[model samples]
Target: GSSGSSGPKTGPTMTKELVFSSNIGQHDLDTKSKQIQQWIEKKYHVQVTIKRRKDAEQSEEETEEIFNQILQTMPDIATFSSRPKAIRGGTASMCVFRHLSKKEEKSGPSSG
Candidate 1:
């Protein structure tokens, strides 16, 4: 969403896309998402793909199902980037996963 007095301003356009998971509405994610995206782009020169889940209206089972779906594609997210910080004493939580580029993967220590 575009920036407005009610929301944070969108940062410069990005190319690489990162993934974000949060149980928040589009309106709420508006400010939070832009902020998170800007931080990431500034820190790592990457962007985020905000994935929204309407947990507010879903059952525990349904919410879990959606979360599982996000997990299923975890490998696709960029690394080296930080996850969004939780807000309002845990009303929302974000997971940041993956290397900003192939170079990041090589910077890590040997798994073994």
Candidate 2:
């Protein structure tokens, strides 16, 4: 029995799509994402979706709304653009915490 042409085939058919979000410009991440997609598809047959937000001027209202959402979530990890005033005072404040080995602290930079 003779079999007809199945059809013209295209790129690897990705079976899944995963969403990625970035606040930074897409230009910075486009190549990196493509590389990751290629590697993952070879093994898992999947795709990626990038959700990018424009880097543009924002109004105060929008800023407040975003912060409110963050507060609601109470993330285990968060970053601040500047030292929050709530932790600003004359006395020693512990808003930021970092751990260093006793040896490292002892060998830390000292005035010349």
Candidate 3:
């Protein structure tokens, strides 16, 4: 017999699963972080989940400096699915793409 669908039969997104959790880039990281995120669309599973460990570093630059840095780019880059806050982990948050969704009805200026 045919098997049921495993999960939502959505898509098979590529391995470029944009999940970053590094502390250093050894160079201009913001330049890399900013431009790197602008290339994906909402159709595929490409996303941004920038993260770092809790004071688990080889250097002194805390993640707020990094988090805030990434957050700045987000206004034009992405939006936070889980807003920035720290606890169990260090500076870490989810980021999503810009305009790529449904349309509104003609009668009401609302969602589709």
Candidate 4:
């Protein structure tokens, strides 16, 4: 239910599991893809599942389709730590957070 910019600050983490898939500021992302779901459940008491479509051969449409599936399920959290393979440009992959109303984004920092 939280996004990149919306999370706890300076407080104890409610869960120990950090299944990161995106780069938020300077935070690190985990490379072991298969363990993500288990990591989340073990640490956060939440069951998380991810389709590792990023490495396999896939068309843009296919990737979007995969993303769509995840959005529909609406896990407790999602990460977008797309690692860099490029020489530059941050090489950051996009994150698609589903079903938030337009009003939510415009409601300022506290609204997410």
Per TM-score, the best of the predicted structures is: 3
TM-score versus the correct structure, for each prediction = 0.29, 0.21, 0.39, 0.26
Best candidate (score: lDDT): 3
User: Where does candidate 3 clash, by residue pair?
Assistant: none
Query: How would the candidate models be sorted by TM-score, starting from the highest?
Result: 3, 1, 4, 2
The better candidate by TM-score, 2 or 4, is: 4
- Which lDDT values do the candidates have, in the order given? 0.42, 0.32, 0.47, 0.33
Tell me how far the alpha carbon of residue 105 in candidate 4 is from the true structure, in angstroms, after superposition. 16
Order of models, best lDDT first:
3, 1, 4, 2
Candidate 1, clashing residue pairs?
Answer: 78-98, 78-99, 79-98, 79-99
Per-residue lDDT over 10-106 for candidate 3, one digit per residue giving the tens place of the 0 to 100 score = 3465433466566557366676555545443233434456566665653424544654565455443343434445444544655444322334122
Q: For candidate 2, lDDT tens digit of each residue in 1-112?
A: 5456555454474444444343534464555444443443233333333232443354334333433332222222222212312112211111211122122222213414
Candidate 1 lDDT over residue span 1-112, tens digit each:
4443443444565544445564555566455444544444333344334344543554344433433343333333334245544334433344453335543322223324
Query: Could you tell me the TM-score of candidate 4?
Result: 0.26
In the range 28-86, model 4's lDDT, one tens digit per residue, is 22233233443332233322222333354543454344334443333433333231122
Quote the lDDT for 79 in model 3.
39
Residue 51 of model 4 has an lDDT of 37
lDDT of 1: 0.42
> How many collisions between residues are there in candidate 3?
0
lDDT of model 1 at residue 34?
A: 47
Scanning candidate 1 in windows of ten residues, the lowest lDDT window is 103-112
Please state the error at residue 81 of candidate 2 in Å: 40
